[PDB]
């Protein structure tokens, strides 16, 4: 691509600016996104519409001028081929239906998510300005989504399942780990320049449980990906300060973290790449605050490579596009 | 008191076994608690009823056999003397009403919370089995309640206030810090054997914001208490893994932490006392799981003192009394090798 700052940074090579892209950069806060979203009632149908998905994926590039495009999809799509009914209820969130019996799940056939690979290829041919990021949800997060039926405020079911039914928990984690691995391999084969693993729900776990029930699977998943290809791998996880000392063990090219950690300090302690980590809520403040908090962080970054600016989580639907663009531009114009 | 395991542990002295008490050990899950609560109109009135607050304070001792009593009260009571209306709508939660202008707060008069010191005194007179713990909310947590007017679930207003109005944020934190300091001091004079500072809502802050906007106030608060009395000070804070490296700098005798950190590991890297930190949700599981999770933690504690078992956060009102009793006895029966 014409702009390869993201790739150079992840590879530890010389760069003249820190690359920037934002999680959920293509989303409801964007007028252009809502217009396309309104053409197809069902969200899952939208994810399968190669034309519209491609069009949405490109929006951030044109509108924000970010240094990378992340394909438009959902972390739950690989669950459908397993025999899980996946639906999104407007203003209500995802709803996942299944018998609750792990053995009823069907062996994963990567070709059943072909539309995702088709979008990656289409996006690569639609533009050559920036790299394309492929992604999948991490095993634990997908497991919890499935056990909770799509949503939860306490995650009791997930915890009771993990603690009281370790045999089925392992059985399910093995299925999801291999599913995400096969799914991601196909995305790389389709042309993804980078792949990001989203473990958004691990912050609900104690350090003790993350180490015993999640770490083994994630370590395996990431190692297998690195053996398969040199495609950079990014692992995103909430509750970052809790799991950081374990996560650095992964063969991830970069760890995407939230605001519970101080990236400038992490760069002084660990020989690893980092992405993040502005608190999204800062975008609700005045541009003056956004400027001080953002430049305050960029000026403290002690390295000149292996850093990618991003938020500590995804953009919210109610944030102002003007402020989102302002943030992207602060990073894009910051001299190294 | 006859049992001073908690104090000996906090002072780093020899103990025969680890002491245990649980945040929110007194709650509706106890029938006697429910009957006492129905004796009074409002929740604030109940907190001000010295006779009944004392009765409630004693229930955990009799029912659970915990190693310490924490006086029955609420972290929001010292806000009333500042001129803020404090209400507890049953079914909804706390509601705080005030102008929003720091200049409208009244100078704190510690005597206005005298009922709290009377409860401490009454509890000490009512039993001599275990130590009594006094407590207060930490300045940031109280400030967030004041800005959010109660609960929020996003603390958006708190953050904007803090980032966009630093002058007023400082003025308010100064007031709350001095208020909490004087309030805790009176509890100590009244006889509190230990005082715990609850910073329940700081988990909603980024590490950088905690260091810049909270750390200075808590450090001052704790150092001043320690200069005032040798009374052990426990600092409780959520988002423990995020702020732990800063919190260890406090002159606190123990840090009460949540399940985001591993206490056995903390004892191997920090020369501090620790309280906690079983995830409350473990109590929703089978007694087999509770046993495995609790003993699994206890067996890994590397020290023989300066450790106090507790949950990582308060008990939920819906957790089962029988399972909570089970947990307490599990800890009390653990042999210190």
In short:
The PDB classes it as lyase. Two copies of one chain form a homodimer. Chain A is α/β, with parallel strands linked by helices and 336 residues long.
Describe this structure in words.
Chain A: This is Uroporphyrinogen decarboxylase. The structure is a homodimer. A 7-stranded parallel sheet of chain A has the order 1-4-5-6-7-8-9. The first copy, chain A, contains 14 helices and 9 strands. Chain A is globular. The first copy, chain A, has 336 residues and is an alpha/beta fold. The longest helix of chain A is centred in the middle third of the chain and has 24 residues. Chains A and B meet through helix 7 of A and helix 7 and helix 13 of B.
């Amino acid at each position: 691509p014409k702009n390869d700052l993201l790739l150079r940074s992840l590879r530890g090579e010389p760069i003249g600016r820190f690359p920037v892209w934002l999680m959920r950069q293509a989303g409801r806060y964007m007028p252009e996104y809502r217009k396309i979203r309104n053409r197809v009632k069902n969200f899952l149908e939208l994810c399968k519409n190669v034309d519209l998905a491609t069009e949405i994926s490109l929006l951030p590039l044109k509108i924000l001028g970010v240094d990378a495009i992340i394909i438009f999809s959902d972390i739950l799509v690989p669950l459908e081929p397993l025999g899980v009914k996946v639906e999104f209820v407007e203003g209500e969130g995802p709803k996942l239906s299944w018998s609750g019996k792990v053995s009823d799940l069907k062996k994963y056939d990567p070709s059943q998510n072909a539309y995702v690979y088709e979008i990656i290829k289409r996006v690569k041919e639609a533009q050559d300005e920036v790299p394309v990021i492929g992604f999948a949800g991490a095993p634990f997060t997908l497991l919890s989504y499935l056990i909770e039926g799509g949503a939860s405020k306490d995650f009791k079911s997930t915890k009771l399942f993990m603690w009281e039914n370790p045999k089925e928990y392992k059985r399910l984690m093995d299925i999801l780990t291999e599913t995400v691995l096969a799914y991601l391999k196909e995305q790389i084969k389709a042309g993804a320049d980078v792949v990001q693993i989203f473990d958004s729900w691990v912050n609900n776990l104690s350090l003790e449980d993350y180490g015993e029930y999640v770490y083994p699977y994630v370590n395996y998943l990431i190692s297998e990906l690195k053996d398969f290809s040199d495609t950079p791998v990014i692992y995103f996880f909430r509750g970052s300060s809790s799991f950081i000392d374990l996560a650095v063990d992964y063969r991830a090219d970069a760890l995407s973290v939230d605001w519970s950690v101080d990236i400038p300090e992490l760069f002084k302690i660990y020989d690893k790449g980092f992405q993040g980590n502005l608190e999204p809520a800062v975008l609700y403040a005045s541009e003056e605050v956004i400027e001080e908090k953002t430049l305050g962080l960029l000026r403290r970054i002690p390295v000149k490579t292996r850093y990618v600016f991003n938020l500590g989580h995804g953009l919210a639907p109610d944030m102002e596009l003007e402020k989102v663009k302002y943030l992207v531009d602060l990073v894009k114009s910051f001299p190294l």
